[PDB]
C-alpha cells in the first residue's frame, strides 16, 4: 500500500497548491498553473522514486509497457477552470509493467478524491463505490460534447445514439465524465480523441466498479497512444458497440486511421 | 414580506423532497413531484388567499396570467437528473406581479444553494451577491445545449454554426440551473428550443439582475402566457448569437415556433 498512499497524498497536496495559484491571482493562469502542478508532480515522484517514469500532459518517447509509469493530467477541464473556476480534476495512472496498480482523479475545488487499487474496489472519499448495473440505451443518459454531432460522419453516427438515448450530458472533464460512469451518475460516455492522461486514472476507478471500456471499434484502451472512446455499463456498452457502431465499423475505421495513424 | 416568505417556503420544500428520498429506502419522481408542488401550493394559498400558482404538476392551467400576483413553480427542475444522478435538479418559482417579473428563485436540492433575486435589488447565490456579466465573444464563450437538438432536422441545422464557432458546448439537464449558471459566470450562453414558463420564470429574473438577457430564437420577448424557444447570454454575445446566426433563419424559426 506504500506507492497508493504516497501517490493519493501527493494529488491531494497538488489540489490545495492549484487553490493557493488561484488564490494569489485574486487564458494565461491555466498554462501556469498546468505547468505549476505538473512540475511538483514530477519532482516529488523523482525524488521519492529516482527510477519511475511520468507520461506527461505538460510533456515530461517513453515505453510504456516497462517498469513504473505515472500518467499525469494536472489539469483535466482547462476550459472548465478558465471560465468557471471548478470542474476541473487533476488525474493520476499509475501503471507497472504494462500493467494498471492505481488511478486517482481529485475534483480539487470540491474536494473529493475519486479513487482505486487495481483488485481493491473503488471510492469516493472513504465511501465505496458499487458495481454497475445494466441499463439498456433508452432508459440511459449518456455524456457525448455537442460538438460530435456537427462533424461530417461522426455526427451521423453519433446522432442515432443520441436519438435512442433518454438523454444527454457534457460536463467539460473527461476524467470526471469517466468517473460519472464509475458513480452511475452518467450510463455511458464517449468521444473520438483522449489522450491516455485523460483517462489512465479514470479507467482503474471504472474497472472497479465493473464497468467497460473500449475505443469506438471495441478495441481495449491501453496507455501506449490516444485513442476514441466508449465507457458504461456492461449491458449498454454492448448495446452501442454492437447495435450501433457495428452497423458503421468501416467508416470509423476510417476516421480513426485519419485521426491517429503515423 | 413577500421576498422572505418565498425563501424560506422554497427551502422547506426542498427539505421535503430530502425527506421523501430518505424515506425511499421512477414512480419516485412521480409521487415526490406532486407531494412538493401540493405542499407550495396550499402554503402560498394559506398566506396568499388571492395570488394564482402556475404549476408543472397542473396547478392554474389557463389562468391568464397577467392578472394580480402568480407564482410559477417547478418543483423538480431536471426530474431525469433526479432519477439518475439523485442531484443536478432544482425547484424554480418565478413571482409575477401584473404580467411582469418581481422575484426568482432557484434551489438547487442536493447542494442547499439557494440563488435568488428581487428586481431592482440584485441577484444572490444564498447570501452572496453575483457580479453583473461582462461581455463575450462567441469564440472564447462556452455555450449550453442539449446534444439532442442537433440531431433535430431543421433545429439541427439552425443550432448547427453556433455550435462550431462557440469555444465549447456543455449540458446540465436542468434548465432553471443552465440559466442560473449563465447568471453567474459558469456559462456565457444557454438556448433550447422548448422549454415550459415555469423552468425558466424564476431563472430570468437571477440573470436580468445581472445585466444578461433573454428573449426567444426569433429574438422576442420571454413572458409567463405559454412556452417559448429561449435563448439567454451576456449582451455582446447575445447579440452576436442571435444578429449574426439566428437572424438567416428567421422565416424557418418562425414556421418552427407556431
Redesign the interface.
Same mark, same amino acid.
Given at each position: 500500500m506504500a506507492l497508493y498512499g504516497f501517490a493519493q497524498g501527493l494529488i491531494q497536496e497538488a489540489g490545495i497548491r492549484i487553490k493557493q495559484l488561484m488564490e494569489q491571482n485574486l487564458n494565461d493562469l491555466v498554462t501556469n498553473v498546468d505547468k505549476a502542478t505538473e512540475d511538483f508532480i514530477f519532482d516529488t515522484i523523482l525524488e521519492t522514486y529516482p527510477n519511475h517514469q511520468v507520461l506527461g500532459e505538460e510533456g515530461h518517447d517513453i515505453d510504456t509497457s516497462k517498469g513504473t509509469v505515472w500518467v499525469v493530467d494536472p489539469i483535466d477541464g482547462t #476550459?472548465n477552470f478558465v471560465?468557471?473556476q471548478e470542474n476541473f480534476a487533476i488525474s493520476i495512472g499509475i501503471y507497472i509493467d504494462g500493467k494498471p496498480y492505481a488511478g486517482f482523479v481529485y475534483d480539487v475545488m470540491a474536494d473529493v478524491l475519486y479513487h482505486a487499487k487495481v483488485g481493491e474496489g473503488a471510492y469516493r472519499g472513504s465511501q465505496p463505490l458499487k458495481p454497475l448495473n445494466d441499463s439498456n440505451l433508452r432508459q440511459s443518459?449518456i455524456g457525448? %460534447?455537442? %460538438?460530435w #454531432?456537427?462533424k461530417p460522419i461522426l455526427?451521423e453516427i453519433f446522432?442515432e445514439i443520441? %436519438?435512442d438515448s433518454?438523454?444527454?450530458?457534457?460536463?467539460?472533464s473527461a476524467a470526471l465524465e469517466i468517473v460519472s460512469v464509475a458513480t452511475? %451518475? #452518467?450510463?455511458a460516455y464517449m468521444t473520438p480523441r483522449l489522450q491516455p492522461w485523460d483517462f489512465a486514472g479514470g479507467l482503474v476507478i471504472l474497472y472497479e466498479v465493473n464497468g467497460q471500456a473500449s475505443n469506438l471499434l471495441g478495441e481495449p484502451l491501453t496507455i501506449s497512444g490516444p485513442n476514441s472512446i466508449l465507457v458504461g455499463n456492461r449491458g449498454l456498452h454492448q448495446e452501442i458497440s454492437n447495435d450501433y457502431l457495428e452497423p458503421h465499423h468501416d467508416a470509423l475505421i476510417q476516421l480513426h486511421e485519419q485521426r491517429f495513424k503515423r
Amino acid at each position: 500500500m506504500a506507492l497508493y498512499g504516497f501517490a493519493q497524498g501527493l494529488i491531494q497536496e497538488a489540489g490545495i497548491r492549484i487553490k493557493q495559484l488561484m488564490e494569489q491571482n485574486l487564458n494565461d493562469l491555466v498554462t501556469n498553473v498546468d505547468k505549476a502542478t505538473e512540475d511538483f508532480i514530477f519532482d516529488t515522484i523523482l525524488e521519492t522514486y529516482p527510477n519511475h517514469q511520468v507520461l506527461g500532459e505538460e510533456g515530461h518517447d517513453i515505453d510504456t509497457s516497462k517498469g513504473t509509469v505515472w500518467v499525469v493530467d494536472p489539469i483535466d477541464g482547462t #476550459l472548465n477552470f478558465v471560465h468557471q473556476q471548478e470542474n476541473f480534476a487533476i488525474s493520476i495512472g499509475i501503471y507497472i509493467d504494462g500493467k494498471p496498480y492505481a488511478g486517482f482523479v481529485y475534483d480539487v475545488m470540491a474536494d473529493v478524491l475519486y479513487h482505486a487499487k487495481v483488485g481493491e474496489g473503488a471510492y469516493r472519499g472513504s465511501q465505496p463505490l458499487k458495481p454497475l448495473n445494466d441499463s439498456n440505451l433508452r432508459q440511459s443518459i449518456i455524456g457525448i %460534447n455537442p %460538438n460530435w #454531432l456537427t462533424k461530417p460522419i461522426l455526427g451521423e453516427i453519433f446522432k442515432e445514439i443520441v %436519438n435512442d438515448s433518454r438523454s444527454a450530458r457534457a460536463y467539460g472533464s473527461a476524467a470526471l465524465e469517466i468517473v460519472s460512469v464509475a458513480t452511475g %451518475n #452518467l450510463e455511458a460516455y464517449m468521444t473520438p480523441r483522449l489522450q491516455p492522461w485523460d483517462f489512465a486514472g479514470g479507467l482503474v476507478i471504472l474497472y472497479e466498479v465493473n464497468g467497460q471500456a473500449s475505443n469506438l471499434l471495441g478495441e481495449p484502451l491501453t496507455i501506449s497512444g490516444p485513442n476514441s472512446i466508449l465507457v458504461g455499463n456492461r449491458g449498454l456498452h454492448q448495446e452501442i458497440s454492437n447495435d450501433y457502431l457495428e452497423p458503421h465499423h468501416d467508416a470509423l475505421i476510417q476516421l480513426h486511421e485519419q485521426r491517429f495513424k503515423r
